[PDB]
């Protein structure tokens, strides 16, 4: 027999073949795994992996985030790539003439980007415009901004948002939260 | 009843020494501790203030803070299936520099010297230490060293 | 007529029978795993029955093949039969059990015309 050092027959732990049954997403995957296989470009592999992701690992990306990303140096004439959805943001009042490639656009985001003179692009048109990731800029959205993450790691002296339905006075603001009432955490 | 106090089972550990009782020499207080210095912990029993718990006897840590009379040491402590970092505020009588770091830094500057010396001619310093290798061939002479034959000795009582 | 295939190997031609299907009538022969804490069969003591496991699986080249070398395909009519027109060397027709005698004649005639093998060309024949 074998004295095994590792766990046998363990899955990689990484998603392949997105479990969404959406055929258009499957077609994007069929294209981008081919490109990742034959282009020698890391961009194709990044995008292919990102297309597998779940909704919470595909957070929305604001047009204001895109504007920040283009306010970098040498990034004004670049192609922004969001493997996910692009949302609008009324907190900006100017937007540049960039082109943005994404799975989905909200109506407001599309309208803003087009009204600014830009164009809204799909990841398949990105494939013909930039098969190896020419002049691209991949943006991911914020993951820990979620509500569930407030409660991850709940315990004494962590400061991590107890799970609670009704908030206010007399809902978890007593013994265990102030020295006057026993102890503070 | 049971007994698990702070100084439980410290009888021989916080004992002072044989013929080294009394006050402590002044080098303990004239030594200098900066942040990042590696220090071993050995409790003096005559200074009851600023003592470590018995767990940290013979433990080596890194300084993280310096105060009037004390020094802040970080230690790694095994608690179940993981290590937790522990912050002690220890008076310096219970504290001495570890000589391992000094012996490592001497080797550091020696290796730098060797590298600068042998870069002037490119002769492949090979600065890494190596384990004790097997011993090489050699020749043993019998000149004045003729073999002396031995034999097992019989059994005697010797009482 | 069959396509050339290797020697067909099975690795267990004996039916896996439930422990004590020979001892109690209430216990049917359909395989059930013994889930007992003290089961000799679950623990695999020497001299007990064998349990089905994936190592007994058949070669993927010879799986689902009858000894003739054909894969069986059930048919209920000539339209279902005609799917095997260009697959005679791989698939053999089996007329379903609920087909009438007068339609079996038609299916067998068309299968003889198209060169399709039929595994049961004797059901519901009178003479």
């Amino acid at each position: 027999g074998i004295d095994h050092t590792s766990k046998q027959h363990k899955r990689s732990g990484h998603r392949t073949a997105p479990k969404s049954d959406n055929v258009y997403l499957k077609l994007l995957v069929k294209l981008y795994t081919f490109l990742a296989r034959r282009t020698d470009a890391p961009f194709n592999k990044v995008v292919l992996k990102a297309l597998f992701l779940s909704k919470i690992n595909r957070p929305p990306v604001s047009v204001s985030r895109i504007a920040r990303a283009l306010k970098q140096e040498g990034a004004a004439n670049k192609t922004v790539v969001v493997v996910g959805t692009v949302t609008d943001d009324a907190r900006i009042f100017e937007f540049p003439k960039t082109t943005v490639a994404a799975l989905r656009f909200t109506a407001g985001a599309r309208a803003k980007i087009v009204k600014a003179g830009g164009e809204c692009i799909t990841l398949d048109q990105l494939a013909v415009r930039a098969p190896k990731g020419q002049n691209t800029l991949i943006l991911r959205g914020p993951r820990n901004s979620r509500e569930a993450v407030r409660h991850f790691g709940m315990g004494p002296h962590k400061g991590k948002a107890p799970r609670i339905l009704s908030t206010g006075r007399k809902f978890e603001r007593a013994r265990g939260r102030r020295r006057s009432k026993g102890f503070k955490v | 009843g049971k007994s698990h106090g702070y100084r439980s089972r410290t009888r021989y550990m916080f004992q002072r020494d044989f013929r080294k009782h009394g006050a402590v020499h002044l080098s303990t207080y004239l030594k200098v501790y900066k942040v990042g210095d590696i220090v071993d912990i050995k409790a003096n029993g005559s200074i009851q203030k600023g003592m470590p718990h018995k767990f940290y006897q013979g433990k080596t840590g890194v300084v993280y803070n310096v105060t009037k009379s004390s020094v802040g040491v970080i230690i790694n402590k095994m608690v179940g299936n993981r290590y937790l970092e522990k912050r002690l505020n220890l008076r310096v009588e219970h504290i001495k520099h570890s000589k391992c770091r000094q012996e490592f830094l001497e080797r550091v500057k020696a290796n730098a010297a060797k590298r600068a010396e042998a870069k002037a001619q490119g002769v492949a310093v090979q600065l890494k230490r190596q384990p004790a290798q097997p011993r090489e061939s050699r020749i043993v002479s019998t000149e004045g060293n003729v073999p002396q034959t031995l034999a097992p000795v019989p059994y005697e009582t010797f009482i | 007529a069959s396509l050339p295939h290797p020697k067909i190997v099975k690795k267990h031609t004996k039916k896996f029978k439930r422990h004590h299907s020979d001892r109690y009538h209430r216990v049917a022969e359909n395989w059930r795993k013994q889930k007992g804490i003290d089961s000799v069969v679950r623990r695999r003591f020497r001299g007990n029955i064998s349990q089905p496991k994936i190592g007994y699986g058949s070669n993927k080249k010879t799986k689902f093949l009858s000894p003739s070398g054909h894969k069986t395909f059930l048919v209920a009519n000539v339209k279902d039969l005609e799917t095997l027109t260009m697959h005679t060397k791989t698939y053999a027709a089996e007329i379903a059990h609920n087909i009438s005698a007068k339609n079996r004649v038609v299916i067998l005639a068309r299968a003889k015309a198209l060169g399709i093998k039929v595994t049961n060309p004797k059901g519901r024949l009178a003479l």
Binding site: - | R135, V140, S141, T142, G144, N145, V146, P147, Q148, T149, L150, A151, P152, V153, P154, Y155 | -
Partner: protein, 171 residues
């Protein structure tokens, strides 16, 4: 196993305080060189401050018998540990080589004293070069003029399991 005699020479490891140490030597009866070198250190640990880590072996050499066909009479001085205590022995063995004598000695001790190889020490093996210095009658018996004796009750071993005549023990 079948024994061999090895000259093993060893030497405390040299230093700056004292190079050229004193080169101790031993004769070892053993089935191979690994066991010979093990026993060399076993005994040298009992005699001197040295062990395999602080010493070395300069030469191991097989000693063959100079006259493997002269019938010698040997005396062997033995230390052996019993179950109660430790004892000394002198045994006389009539044989053709030192290794054969030592084999026979280990077997005789295993038989008559239930002593094992780990329990037996050989102090020395010495050829008795003058008859009448022998002192054991079981050896002195075969040192008689024009000796001759028969072998009564011969048993012939049969290749078959059925014999068609009664056998004979004549000789």
């Amino acid at each position: 196993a079948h024994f061999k005699e090895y000259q093993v020479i060893g030497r405390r490891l040299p230093t700056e305080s004292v190079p050229e140490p004193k080169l101790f030597r031993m004769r070892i009866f053993a089935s191979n060189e690994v066991i010979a070198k093990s026993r060399y250190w076993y005994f040298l640990q009992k005699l001197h401050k040295v062990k395999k880590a602080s010493g070395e072996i300069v030469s191991i050499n097989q000693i063959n018998e100079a006259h493997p066909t002269k019938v010698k009479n040997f005396g062997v001085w033995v230390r052996y540990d019993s179950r109660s205590g430790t004892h000394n022995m002198y045994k006389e063995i009539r044989d053709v080589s030192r290794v054969a004598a030592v084999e026979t000695l280990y077997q005789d001790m295993a038989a008559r004293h239930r002593a094992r190889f780990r329990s037996i020490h050989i102090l020395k093996v010495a050829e008795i070069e003058k008859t009448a210095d022998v002192k054991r009658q079981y050896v002195k018996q075969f040192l008689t003029k024009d000796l001759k004796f028969p072998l009564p009750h011969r048993v012939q071993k049969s290749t078959k399991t059925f014999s068609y005549k009664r056998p004979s023990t004549f000789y």
